[PDB]
Amino acid sequence: VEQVLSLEPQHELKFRGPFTDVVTTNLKLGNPTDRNVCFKVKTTVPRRYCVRPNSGVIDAGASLNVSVMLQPFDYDPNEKSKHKFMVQSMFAPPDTSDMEAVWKEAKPEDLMDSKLRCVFE
Amino acid sequence: SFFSATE
């Protein structure tokens, strides 16, 4: 199922040092359609990043800049990959603003997944 | 494997 959002970057999030401090990089999500689109940002290491906003609605025709903040470290050595992100999107149903139940209700063909890899430079 | 990111 094709991602209707535009992503910039679309494949790799690049984080430049120093890695003793937070490193913020941008993820721009653009909605070229005539419908509002809900989105969620997920990662394999949620304790290592602060992502703002991490979910929400992008109105028809609008873009949103998501701040992805790599923290210096966390206390979770049992986190598998520190390096994978995913943007999940779905159209907002017309008469709906309780996004939580929408996501639960969603059929797999209604969910659009875009994966990204983090690279530390 | 993927978890909701937090702010």
Strand A37-43 and strand A55-58: the pairing is antiparallel
Identify the experimental approach. X-ray
Distance between CA atoms of residues A41 and B5, nearest Å: 6
Resolution in A: 1.7
Shortest Cα–Cα distance, B1 to chain A (Å): 6
Residue type at A68? V
Q: Tokens at residue A49, please?
A: 């990043």
Q: Tokens at residue A104, please?
A: 């639960």
The count of structural domains within chain A is: 1
Local structure of A31: helix, strand or coil = coil
Bridge partners, A112 (sequence order): A89
The dihedral built from the CA positions of residue A107, A13, A28 and A55, taken in this order, carries a sign that is: positive
Question: Which of A43, A50, A53 shows the shortest C-beta gap to B3?
Answer: A43
Decide if B1 and A53 are in contact by the 8 Å CB cutoff: no
The length of chain A in residues reads: 121
**Residue closest to A84 by CA, chosen among A58, A48, A54, A121:** A48
Number of CB atoms found within 10 A of residue A14's CB: 12
Shortest Cα–Cα distance, A96 to chain B (Å): 21
Decide if B6 and A80 are in contact by the 8 Å CB cutoff: no
Residue range(s) defining the domain that contains residue A91: 1-121
Decide if A42 and B4 are in contact by the 8 Å CB cutoff: yes
Q: Taking CB atoms and an 8 Å cutoff, what residues of chain A touch B4?
A: 40-42, 46, 54-55
Q: Tokens at residue A78, please?
A: 């049992």
Bridge partners, A91 (sequence order): A37
Q: Taking CB atoms and an 8 Å cutoff, what residues of chain B touch A41?
A: 4-5
